Amino acid sequence: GRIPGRQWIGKHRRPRFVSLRAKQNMIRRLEIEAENHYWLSMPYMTREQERGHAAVRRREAFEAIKAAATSKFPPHRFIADQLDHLNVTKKWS
Amino acid sequence: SSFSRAPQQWATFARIWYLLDGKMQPPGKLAAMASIRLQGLHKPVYHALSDCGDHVVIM
Amino acid sequence: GGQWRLQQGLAANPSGYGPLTELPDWSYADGRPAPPMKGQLRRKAERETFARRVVLLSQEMDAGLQAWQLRQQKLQEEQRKQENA
Amino acid sequence: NVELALTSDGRTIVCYHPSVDIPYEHTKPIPREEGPMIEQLSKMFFTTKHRWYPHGRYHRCRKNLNPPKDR
Amino acid sequence: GYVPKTSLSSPPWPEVVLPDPVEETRHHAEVVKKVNEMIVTGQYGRLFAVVHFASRQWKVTSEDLILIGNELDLACGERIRLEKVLLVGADNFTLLGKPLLGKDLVRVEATVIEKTESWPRIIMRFRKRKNFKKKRIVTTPQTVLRINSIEIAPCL
Amino acid sequence: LRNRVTDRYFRIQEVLKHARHFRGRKNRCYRLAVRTVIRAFVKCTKARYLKKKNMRTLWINRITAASQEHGLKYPALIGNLVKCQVELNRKVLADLAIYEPKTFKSLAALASRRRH
Amino acid sequence: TARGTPSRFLASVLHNGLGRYVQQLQRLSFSVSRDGASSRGAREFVEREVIDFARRNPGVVIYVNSRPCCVPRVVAEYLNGAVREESIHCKSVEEISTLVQKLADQSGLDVIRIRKPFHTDNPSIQGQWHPFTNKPTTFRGLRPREVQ
Amino acid sequence: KFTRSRIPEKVFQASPEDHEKYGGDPQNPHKLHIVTRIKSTRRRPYWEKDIIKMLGLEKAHTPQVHKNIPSVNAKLKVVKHLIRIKPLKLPQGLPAEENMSNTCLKSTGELVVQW
Ligand SMILES: [Mg+2]
């Protein structure tokens, strides 16, 4: 009793059957999403009320992004870092 | 408790003899009971490598 | 058995919020409290950020509603004020 | 044979489980060649023959002679 | 509603009757008092305790050694109190928290005996025919704690 | 031969020391040893998941045995302990089953009582 | 790997925590070079940290040789006789400090795989389970199907 | 072809039976969603992946607070099959600056200012 070809892809596939466990899992997901529908059905503000209520914060956030982007620049260089390399030959006298 | 080491180990890992009466019993259910006992899966000290199986006598 | 915990209002996972994870694991034998655990500190910081976001979003939405109310009031009062002759 | 009891506040469960002795009446008085060898040992210890055959030097030398001991 | 006695008339499991609450409370009080008296009189030898430390539950007794897989920020030889004790048990009685026993009941104390690194653990990633091969060696910090004593108090 | 490798001995030994306990030429010949040592290390890495998976299965088996000794089934024991707010984990429950049979008997009685 | 490596059980040296804690590290020997970039960090450690460590660990005898062999090293000898030798080659002061503190806090027992994260000499208080725990007895100890 | 799905508006019109079932009052609706990702974005369209990233639900089972406003609701409608939405309940009102560090989100969806 063999299934011609490769299983699960061809015209003739292994018969797959739905277990009670699979049905329960799907029903659980469906219930979660029905609740999602209910909770998405009651907007707090209308579209016209929300228009522009976050504009200031969004603009400040993008100002921060622009500042970070435009502040990119090579780091400082210190004489101390250069001179500290002389310590590789520090010894005890 | 308070046993010596060797007697304690002997008691813990001793193999017990069980009796099943197969009269009018389904062979599958008999076999489930017997297989559990033979493997030793009825013992909390069970481990696959401890050889903790028991004897089962089915009549 | 997480469904029962959820029904009783606890965390589904006992390793979530609860006494078993939020209380100090140990203390000095003298009684001095132990330094806060790293996970507890991280979790406190996360909860603080969550509360701060809650406050920010609520305040933004309330301010938006108040601003919309003021805009409606200004529109109606101005259209009334146009009646002057 | 266990007695369970919540405390008055209901925050700790107390289990009383004394050890029960065996009744005296529930006790009895004290009473007063390689092939064949492997078959005999297998029958004696309710094992198969395969356990009793020797192993090669390689396996024997692989075995650890000073295993760690706990407790 | 009477149903004649058949194989399926009643559930296979034996029917259970809830004991009358008055007698239940009386029995509960009696047992609690008896165990409290045992504690008062010191009618117990070794005590064991299930204690939640680090992220795990350890079955513990006096003089036991415990290997925590992380550094604790404690000097070696320093004494500590393990505060999340889930269970404390003796030969003849056990006390179960819901989920944790009170501080007044049980006092489990430990000592930082050792601070070590684990033996080198190998992390090897390999995928065939992809020239994908990676090797890493990781040593985890560890602390050995010795459980010094487990004390219970008659606070039931 | 301006630059020639002089450490190849030690580079080979680093691999071979991990293969010394293999069978056959895999413990001697670097060509064969290196392939098997890589497989050994990959197995060692992937075995950290199976160790945890098997310990829990071992704990569940031992708890099942111990609870069946008292007429309980493992699902009933675990669920009823949770409902009674006892947060003992399976490792500890198996340890109790083995070393504190009276405490485990108490827990099984508690679980059955809660069930009823 | 575990199968290709020795293993031991969790243990202390002499029940190190029961009565009192005894620091198992007893000797540190720092072989350091006067000259040589390899031992620059060791020199800084000897200058700035070895004295404070010594007075923090009065039970550890610390020797400083100022004349190494083949590399600057720290040899830690523990009470149980174990000797752990660690190269301090090209290590910074902080690296050497952490390494020395690790040696101080660590016991002489081998750093190999530890089979169990716990060690009880008295694993059972109520009696280790044996097949006859939880098994009821019968009148006169009669085995099943016994005639008398 | 496979395309974005337009959810008919009648899907998001609660009935009195739903109001009783779920315990939300259409008048005085809740202000904030608690959204958790309970489903992978793998094997889902790139637009659902992008919506999840926007909403900040990359980690599953990590609650995120969002405004209960029409635009956020549009995005949530797009990815409603990957998330669990519950109203954020504030029994003691929103936390004050004093107790901002002592809040905890109970599994019931309540932000309690004591922990
Ligand atoms: Mg085929």
Side-chain angles (χ1 to χ4, degrees):
Chain A
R2 63 182 293 278
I3 282 293
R6 188 264 182 276
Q7 291 169 170
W8 305 125
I9 69 162
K11 158 152 68 165
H12 302 314
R13 307 175 184 183
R14 285 187 70 237
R16 180 69 175 171
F17 307 108
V18 294
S19 54
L20 178 74
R21 184 169 49 179
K23 281 156 48 60
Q24 287 165 354
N25 294 348
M26 176 155 294
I27 286 166
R28 195 176 313 118
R29 224 160 298 275
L30 286 164
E31 291 168 352
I32 294 170
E33 186 175 3
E35 186 156 358
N36 282 357
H37 288 177
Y38 170 75
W39 291 121
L40 280 176
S41 73
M42 46 192 283
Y44 182 61
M45 309 169 76
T46 78
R47 210 158 261 278
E48 304 79 22
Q49 299 169 334
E50 72 168 358
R51 200 161 284 116
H53 78 278
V56 175
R57 179 183 55 75
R58 297 175 85 259
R59 187 184 326 111
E60 300 326 305
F62 184 50
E63 287 299 317
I65 291 168
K66 283 197 298 187
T70 59
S71 63
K72 197 164 51 169
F73 200 73
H76 308 302
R77 282 163 176 268
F78 308 87
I79 312 183
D81 300 350
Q82 184 178 2
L83 295 183
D84 181 50
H85 191 74
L86 297 182
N87 284 319
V88 300
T89 55
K90 183 159 58 178
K91 314 173 195 308
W92 279 344
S93 63
Chain B
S1 187
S2 308
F3 301 155
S4 310
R5 272 87 168 94
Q8 173 64 79
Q9 193 272 346
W10 192 261
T12 297
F13 283 101
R15 55 188 63 180
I16 305 303
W17 291 70
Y18 294 98
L19 181 70
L20 276 168
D21 194 354
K23 187 173 286 293
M24 297 267 189
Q25 297 303 308
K29 287 197 172 80
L30 287 174
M33 300 189 73
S35 75
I36 285 168
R37 301 302 194 289
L38 287 169
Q39 293 181 240
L41 279 165
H42 66 295
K43 299 169 157 177
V45 299
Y46 161 79
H47 194 270
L49 280 183
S50 293
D51 193 20
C52 55
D54 280 355
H55 290 267
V56 178
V57 180
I58 311 189
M59 61 189 290
Chain C
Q3 288 301 307
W4 179 87
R5 294 191 199 86
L6 282 181
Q7 294 169 20
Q8 313 311 310
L10 304 164
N13 191 355
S15 285
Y17 72 84
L20 193 66
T21 70
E22 301 299 343
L23 292 179
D25 267 1
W26 58 272
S27 70
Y28 298 99
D30 316 314
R32 305 137 52 200
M37 308 207 295
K38 314 279 174 52
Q40 293 175 340
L41 285 175
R42 172 184 49 80
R43 212 170 307 109
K44 262 197 57 173
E46 291 170 2
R47 283 198 295 264
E48 182 167 324
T49 60
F50 183 88
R52 288 198 185 286
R53 180 172 182 175
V54 164
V55 168
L56 180 81
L57 300 193
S58 286
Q59 288 181 346
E60 270 200 0
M61 278 190 305
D62 291 348
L65 279 182
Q66 294 296 348
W68 181 80
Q69 288 291 352
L70 262 69
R71 285 202 305 270
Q72 301 299 296
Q73 294 296 320
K74 293 288 180 65
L75 264 289
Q76 74 178 2
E77 82 180 6
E78 195 177 10
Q79 83 91 19
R80 287 192 297 272
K81 186 262 289 180
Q82 286 300 323
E83 295 176 353
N84 270 340
Chain D
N1 296 351
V2 187
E3 308 291 281
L4 277 295
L6 288 162
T7 50
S8 56
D9 55 38
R11 290 293 90 199
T12 62
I13 298 168
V14 179
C15 309
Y16 182 60
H17 44 76
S19 47
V20 62
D21 284 355
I22 299 174
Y24 180 95
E25 295 82 4
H26 290 208
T27 65
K28 317 164 81 74
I30 293 294
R32 267 85 184 186
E33 305 156 329
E34 193 197 37
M37 187 190 68
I38 287 182
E39 296 159 17
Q40 164 175 118
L41 286 160
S42 303
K43 200 182 194 307
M44 192 195 312
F45 291 108
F46 302 94
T47 56
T48 53
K49 58 174 188 184
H50 314 89
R51 196 193 192 288
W52 311 97
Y53 288 106
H55 280 92
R57 200 201 161 277
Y58 180 68
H59 287 164
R60 289 190 323 260
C61 192
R62 283 171 54 83
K63 177 170 174 160
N64 190 2
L65 297 180
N66 291 317
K69 184 177 182 293
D70 193 38
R71 164 172 58 252
Chain E
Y2 160 71
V3 174
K5 175 54 65 182
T6 59
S7 53
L8 295 173
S9 64
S10 162
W13 53 85
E15 184 183 352
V16 295
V17 183
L18 303 178
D20 50 312
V22 183
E23 198 276 331
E24 183 177 1
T25 56
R26 187 221 58 85
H27 160 269
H28 280 53
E30 176 201 6
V31 174
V32 167
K33 189 177 191 57
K34 184 189 315 173
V35 168
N36 202 83
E37 286 310 308
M38 294 175 64
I39 299 169
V40 168
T41 53
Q43 286 174 34
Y44 53 88
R46 291 203 76 89
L47 294 173
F48 72 94
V50 177
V51 168
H52 179 285
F53 193 77
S55 167
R56 301 158 206 79
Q57 292 160 20
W58 310 83
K59 200 273 188 181
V60 161
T61 186
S62 300
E63 315 160 351
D64 182 359
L65 287 174
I66 296 303
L67 181 72
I68 316 299
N70 64 7
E71 65 96 24
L72 273 178
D73 194 9
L74 290 161
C76 278
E78 191 166 4
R79 205 179 183 89
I80 296 302
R81 180 180 179 179
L82 310 190
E83 291 203 320
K84 297 174 177 164
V85 61
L86 280 76
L87 188 156
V88 62
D91 191 16
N92 298 318
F93 63 91
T94 56
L95 317 176
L96 290 161
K98 300 167 66 76
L100 285 177
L101 291 166
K103 304 291 182 70
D104 48 292
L105 283 172
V106 188
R107 183 177 188 89
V108 178
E109 279 186 344
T111 301
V112 178
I113 307 309
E114 203 182 355
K115 303 158 69 66
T116 312
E117 277 178 358
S118 72
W119 68 304
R121 313 297 302 283
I122 303 167
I123 304 148
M124 196 79 201
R125 268 63 184 261
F126 180 89
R127 293 175 201 169
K128 68 181 71 175
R129 295 174 290 102
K130 293 295 167 180
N131 196 23
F132 188 84
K133 198 215 308 181
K134 313 198 295 181
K135 185 186 184 192
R136 180 188 178 186
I137 308 290
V138 65
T139 51
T140 308
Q142 289 175 337
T143 57
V144 187
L145 283 161
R146 180 177 294 278
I147 313 298
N148 300 118
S149 63
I150 307 182
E151 287 95 2
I152 52 179
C155 289
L156 287 170
Chain F
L1 305 165
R2 170 80 178 78
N3 280 346
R4 289 226 270 164
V5 166
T6 58
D7 290 339
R8 209 177 279 105
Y9 171 82
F10 306 103
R11 314 187 184 195
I12 297 296
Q13 291 308 126
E14 283 158 14
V15 167
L16 283 186
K17 71 176 303 307
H18 297 308
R20 289 313 190 187
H21 63 289
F22 294 175
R23 271 210 50 170
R25 294 186 280 163
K26 314 191 305 293
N27 55 36
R28 281 182 315 276
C29 301
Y30 180 88
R31 180 182 296 272
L32 317 171
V34 66
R35 299 191 198 118
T36 311
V37 163
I38 288 165
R39 287 191 60 89
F41 287 178
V42 170
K43 286 170 191 294
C44 176
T45 307
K46 286 183 180 174
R48 314 209 172 98
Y49 302 98
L50 293 168
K51 187 184 180 183
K52 302 165 180 51
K53 175 174 182 54
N54 297 330
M55 281 297 99
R56 194 169 154 108
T57 301
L58 178 69
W59 299 329
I60 289 163
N61 285 342
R62 291 177 164 172
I63 295 165
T64 305
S67 69
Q68 288 284 4
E69 282 197 325
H70 298 296
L72 277 180
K73 294 177 180 178
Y74 168 88
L77 178 80
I78 284 292
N80 298 128
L81 280 187
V82 166
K83 296 172 185 298
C84 281
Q85 292 183 306
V86 175
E87 291 303 335
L88 299 169
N89 62 18
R90 290 150 187 81
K91 180 194 186 182
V92 163
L93 276 167
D95 292 346
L96 295 172
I98 295 166
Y99 289 113
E100 277 77 10
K102 294 153 75 186
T103 306
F104 194 92
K105 183 170 170 37
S106 309
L107 286 163
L110 187 149
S112 62
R113 187 185 72 85
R114 182 59 173 77
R115 196 157 189 247
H116 308 319
Chain G
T1 69
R3 294 186 69 112
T5 297
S7 61
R8 65 176 181 86
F9 285 103
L10 187 62
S12 47
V13 171
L14 270 183
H15 311 107
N16 192 25
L18 284 182
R20 68 184 60 171
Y21 169 74
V22 177
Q23 187 175 19
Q24 297 303 310
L25 178 69
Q26 61 159 333
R27 200 163 306 114
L28 276 180
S29 304
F30 294 84
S31 57
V32 184
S33 177
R34 294 194 331 117
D35 295 332
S38 52
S39 59
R40 181 187 62 183
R43 280 192 297 271
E44 307 315 318
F45 177 83
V46 169
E47 282 177 280
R48 289 155 39 186
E49 312 283 332
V50 69
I51 297 182
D52 310 73
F53 179 84
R55 62 181 65 264
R56 283 195 314 265
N57 299 108
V60 183
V61 184
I62 306 177
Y63 302 93
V64 184
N65 290 138
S66 197
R67 182 229 175 181
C69 188
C70 305
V71 65
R73 292 178 289 98
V74 58
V75 174
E77 313 187 32
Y78 297 88
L79 290 171
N80 71 336
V83 173
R84 178 170 175 174
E85 165 177 319
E86 287 290 310
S87 62
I88 52 178
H89 173 81
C90 290
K91 279 190 172 56
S92 60
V93 189
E94 56 269 14
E95 288 174 73
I96 296 180
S97 296
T98 60
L99 164 62
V100 169
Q101 189 49 242
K102 184 181 70 58
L103 293 175
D105 291 328
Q106 187 175 358
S107 178
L109 295 171
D110 300 344
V111 193
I112 54 184
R113 183 180 68 90
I114 292 159
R115 297 207 172 192
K116 277 137 74 168
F118 40 73
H119 168 238
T120 42
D121 272 313
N122 297 273
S124 184
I125 297 88
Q126 301 169 359
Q128 181 174 118
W129 182 97
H130 55 75
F132 285 127
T133 57
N134 309 331
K135 271 203 195 319
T137 57
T138 64
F139 184 67
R140 285 188 288 119
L142 288 172
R143 72 185 68 96
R145 243 77 169 182
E146 202 170 358
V147 289
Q148 291 185 351
Chain H
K1 304 187 201 305
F2 183 50
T3 60
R4 284 81 172 275
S5 53
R6 286 179 29 85
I7 317 301
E9 262 303 314
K10 64 99 174 179
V11 174
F12 305 103
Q13 289 164 5
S15 74
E17 294 78 3
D18 300 333
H19 293 300
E20 303 306 314
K21 180 176 181 179
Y22 298 113
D25 49 353
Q27 284 74 38
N28 187 30
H30 72 275
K31 293 211 289 194
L32 298 173
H33 300 290
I34 307 167
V35 294
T36 71
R37 177 165 82 67
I38 59 167
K39 195 72 168 60
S40 195
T41 61
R42 307 228 63 202
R43 306 164 191 282
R44 299 308 308 175
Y46 68 89
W47 58 83
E48 295 178 14
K49 295 198 183 77
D50 296 351
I51 294 288
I52 284 288
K53 277 179 48 55
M54 293 160 187
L55 296 169
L57 297 174
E58 311 94 351
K59 274 188 75 75
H61 316 296
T62 300
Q64 184 65 255
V65 62
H66 276 286
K67 298 158 153 171
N68 184 22
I69 59 177
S71 49
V72 176
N73 286 358
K75 287 190 182 64
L76 265 55
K77 288 170 190 180
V78 172
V79 292
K80 56 188 185 53
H81 57 282
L82 310 169
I83 63 184
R84 179 198 311 271
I85 306 166
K86 307 287 279 295
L88 173 73
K89 286 172 294 186
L90 290 162
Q92 295 87 18
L94 57 91
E97 183 65 28
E98 173 173 341
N99 51 62
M100 201 75 71
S101 199
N102 305 320
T103 64
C104 195
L105 182 61
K106 289 286 150 290
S107 61
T108 58
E110 298 173 345
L111 188 65
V112 292
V113 300
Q114 293 181 353
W115 188 233

